[PDB]
Amino acid sequence: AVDTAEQVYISSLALLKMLKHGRAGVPMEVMGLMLGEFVDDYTVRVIDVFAMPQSGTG
Amino acid sequence: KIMKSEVLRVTHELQAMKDKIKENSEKIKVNKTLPYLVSNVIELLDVDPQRKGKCAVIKTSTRQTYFLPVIGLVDAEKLKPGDLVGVNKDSYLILETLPTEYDSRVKAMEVDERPTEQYSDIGGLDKQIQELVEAIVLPMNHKEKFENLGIQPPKGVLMYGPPGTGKTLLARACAAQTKATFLKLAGPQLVQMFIGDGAKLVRDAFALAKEKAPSIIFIDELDAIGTKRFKAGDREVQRTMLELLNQLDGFQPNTQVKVIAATNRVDILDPALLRSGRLDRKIEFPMPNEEARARIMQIHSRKMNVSPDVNYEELARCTDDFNGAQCKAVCVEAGMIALRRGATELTHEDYMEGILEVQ
Amino acid sequence: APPALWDLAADKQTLQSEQPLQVARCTKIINADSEDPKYIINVKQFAKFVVDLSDQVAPTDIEEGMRVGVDRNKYQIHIPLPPPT
């Protein structure tokens, strides 16, 4: 039972990938996966972000 | 054979294509799974000046109009102004088009799979019913021979004669031999309160005959609406009727399911009912004589315990100027009071008892 | 308030029971059935819908023009219901 103060680091990679993914953000539900490395407890860094093929289920 | 050794690479590329079509062909099931709503389609050809012009007008069930071109898979019976088409959530594309009904009051007019009675229930009519039995058996199984001889079966047969002769249960008895889907339709059903209903009923009849599997559509009481008047309601029945004749005259692909008709009287004979597709087969069905009435009454009464001492002379004398369904009512009435007569065996007085009972 | 006391104390499990039974698509009634997978349905808002049958309802329990419960997220028929004066 312990909690810290975390903060999500956002570079321009994930940002621009979410902007192109937002351009491909059709009303149909879309999927994506974020990557990165966990260095400590209260920090998180994202580097690699890609898109996923759409499906009828969403 | 050194020049033919490059075919192996081509076959490897083709089988590689068959190996790689499983994924992009596999997503067809997850993308084309279920159209969530129903949207009406109206065909409207556009022009772009490939860059070819092709578009269509869409109308959703919620009264919302959108824009989309003609898209989807290979279309053969599509491109018509119909309903019940495939559509996704918001992409509004056409994926699976299937023709739809509604107004079920006309769609479910007479939903009959097959009847019980057969052609072997009557007696003394083979010389005139054999042409119809041929005209329903040979166009169903001998379609192969129709190309060697170049034969197209007629679509309009006029089963006319005095009423009460059984022109409905007998055509249904032959419809049991057709093995196809039987669909009745009444003449007065075309006369409706609202305007333009007869067009929807006729285009509905050719919508289920044209769209559905090979079936059998038998109509009756056509003479009750086939009046050639010179406002008037029978002139509205001339709009709907002449519309049907226009669909039996201007449609060369009408080689599909036949339309069998029967009139209870030929007093008002429409002269425009003469054509290969129209009512050309005019086989006269007169009132059966006492011999023929004893035949159809004997085969229709071969199930009840009838006394063997029947010479048919008394019933042959009592049956004067009668019809088929009248003797059927005499048989049914005999099967009705013969129960309460105590004797389980049918007596001979029950014939005249029924004749004088119902008539 | 006395009737709402025991039910107010019995309202705790209504939060863990709120996730199920939440489905309600205005009880849309069907019209006909061309094939067993796809069923043509029409909602009271004059919007005709089509959805496949779920695994919780048997196909033999479907009647022509029958008001039954149906999901508004998966669009499937979760559970039917028996119901003029």
**Rounded to an integer, what distance in angstroms lies between the CA atom of residue B83 and that of residue B71?**
16
Count of H-run helices and E-run strands, chain C: 2, 3
**Rounded to an integer, what distance in angstroms lies between the CA atom of residue A11 and that of residue A8?**
10
> C47 and B61 in contact by Cβ < 8 A?
yes
**Rounded to an integer, what distance in angstroms lies between the CA atom of residue B344 and that of residue B305?**
7
The nearest CA of chain A is from the CA of B155 a distance in Å of 46
**Rounded to an integer, what distance in angstroms lies between the CA atom of residue B139 and that of residue B196?**
34
**Nearest beta carbon to residue C50 from set B36, B102, B104:** B36
Diameter of chain C by CA atoms? 54
CA distances from C11 to C1, C17, C24 (A): 14, 10, 21
Cα torsion for B9, B15, B16, B18, to the nearest 10°? 160
Structure tokens at B167: 């022109």
Looking at the DSSP bridge assignments, the partners of residue A22 are none
Specify the pairing of strand B259-263 against strand B65-68. Answer: unpaired
Write the DSSP symbol of residue B5.
G
Structure tokens at C57: 């309802």
Please tell me what resolution, in angstroms, this structure has.
5.7
**Residue C62 near residue C39 (C-beta atoms within 8 A):** yes
**Nearest beta carbon to residue B34 from set C32, C45, C51:** C51
**Other CB atoms within 10 A of residue B324 CB:** 25
Tell which residue, B292, B284, B282, has the closest CA to residue B323: B292
Q: Which chains are adjacent to chain C, needing at least 3 Cβ pairs under 8 Å?
A: B
Structure tokens at C11: 């309202």
**Residue B286 near residue B162 (C-beta atoms within 8 A):** yes
Q: Which residues in chain B are closer than 8 Å to C34, comparing Cβ atoms?
A: 98
**Residue B225 near residue B265 (C-beta atoms within 8 A):** no
Looking at the DSSP bridge assignments, the partners of residue B47 are none
User: Position B276: which residue type?
Assistant: S
**Other CB atoms within 10 A of residue B105 CB:** 8
> C40 and B100 in contact by Cβ < 8 A?
yes
Contacts of B239 (CB under 8 A, 6+ apart): B198
**Other CB atoms within 10 A of residue B91 CB:** 13
Phi–psi pair at B297, nearest 5 degrees: -75, -30
Burial B178-212 (b: 16+ CB within 10 A, else e): bebbbbbbebebbeeeeeebbeebbebbbbbbbee
CA B114 vs. chain centroid, Å, equals: 12
Helix axes B324-340, B349-358, angle to 10 degrees: 110
Task: Pick out the residues of the known binding site of B for ATP.
Answer: 161-168
Alpha helices in B113-263 (DSSP H): 126-141, 145-149, 169-178, 197-211, 233-247
**Nearest beta carbon to residue B104 from set C31, C46, C47:** C31
CA C13 vs. chain centroid, Å, equals: 22
CA distances from A55 to A31, B30, B31 (A): 9, 6, 6
Q: Which residues in chain B are closer than 8 Å to C70, comparing Cβ atoms?
A: none
Q: Three-state SS for A17?
A: helix
Looking at the DSSP bridge assignments, the partners of residue B52 are none
Burial B215-245 (b: 16+ CB within 10 A, else e): bbbbbbbbbbbbbeeeeeeeebbbebbeebb
Window B:65-124, CB contacts with A under 8 Å: 88-91
**Rounded to an integer, what distance in angstroms lies between the CA atom of residue B53 and that of residue B179?**
46
CA C39 vs. chain centroid, Å, equals: 15
Specify the pairing of strand C48-52 against strand C38-42. Answer: antiparallel
Taking CA–CA distances from A27, the nearest residue in chain B reads: B90
Taking CA–CA distances from B85, the nearest residue in chain C reads: C50
**Residue C28 near residue C77 (C-beta atoms within 8 A):** no
In chain C, residues preceding a discontinuity (C to N beyond 2.5 A) are: 83
Q: What is the DSSP string of B86-121?
A: ---SSS-----B------HHHHTS--BS--S--GGG
Structure tokens at B329: 């009512």
- Write C27-34 long-range contacts (CB < 8 A, 24+): C27/C67, C27/C68, C27/C69, C27/C70, C27/C81, C28/C70, C29/C65, C29/C66, C29/C67, C30/C62, C30/C64, C30/C65, C30/C66, C31/B102, C31/B104, C31/C64, C31/C65, C32/B101, C32/B104, C32/C64, C33/C62, C33/C64, C34/B98
Q: How many CB pairs under 8 A join B and C?
A: 35
**Residue B117 near residue B176 (C-beta atoms within 8 A):** yes
Structure tokens at B35: 């159209």
> C49 and B84 in contact by Cβ < 8 A?
no
CA distances from B36 to A55, B50, B62 (A): 15, 33, 13
> B62 and C52 in contact by Cβ < 8 A?
no
Q: Which residues in chain C are closer than 8 Å to B60, comparing Cβ atoms?
A: 47
Method by which the model was determined: cryo-EM
Q: How many CA atoms lie within 13 A of B123 on its CB side?
A: 14
